[PDB]
Design a protein around this ligand. Sequence first.
Ligand SMILES: *[C@@H]1O[C@H](CO)[C@@H](O)[C@H](O)[C@H]1NC(C)=O
Lengths: 49, 118, 49
Amino acid sequence: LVRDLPQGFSALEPLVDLPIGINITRFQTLLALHRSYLTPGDSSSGWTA
Amino acid sequence: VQLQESGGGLVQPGGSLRLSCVASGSVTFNSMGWYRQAPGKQRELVAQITAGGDTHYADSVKGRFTISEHRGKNAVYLEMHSLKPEDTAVYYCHLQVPFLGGGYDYWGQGTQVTVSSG
Amino acid sequence: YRVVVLSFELLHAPATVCGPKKSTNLVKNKCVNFNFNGLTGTGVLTESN
Ligand SMILES: *[C@@H]1O[C@H](CO)[C@@H](O)[C@H](O)[C@H]1NC(C)=O
């Protein structure tokens, strides 16, 4: 029942280091397309709006 | 990095010994896996234990491996008995640590175990 | 001629092919000089809970 960040504190544990060694300046997020681009539905073809 | 494992003993066929993934502390998990690989063949599966209680074994290892989980020392122990020379391999412990919803097992660590009469 | 080339990657990575930095054996309950992964010093080394 929280849409935004819930109030509280939680320490972050270090999962993994990656040996890349290149510059990074811009980033992007990849989502799952639940609907169809060729024949989009009227509604609910996505995931719960 | 994080976790680690080594050890193991070289024994004659038909013996019994306890492979142990040496503990690296309390880690969140739901599935512990013992897994074996030998050169010249595809890396194969040995057995998985589940924090809930599920236990799965490979088809070729019936009646010879017993898997157990110890939550105080948080280590999985495989007791192996009635050995035949097809177990000559190196054995790895793959984790389950939830990454985005599971993944990134720590099976980097290995234990070289060869069963032989000489 | 059987030609074998070993290319070693000395990059900004957690080293994986290493170990000839042999360790001999360790001693406990006795005041010794210790070099622990670069931590140099002296002391008695005991089991910790
Ligand atoms: C990448 O970073 C290096 C600094 O190490 C800099 O010299 C170089 O110009 C950078 N290149 C780009 C494309 O950002």
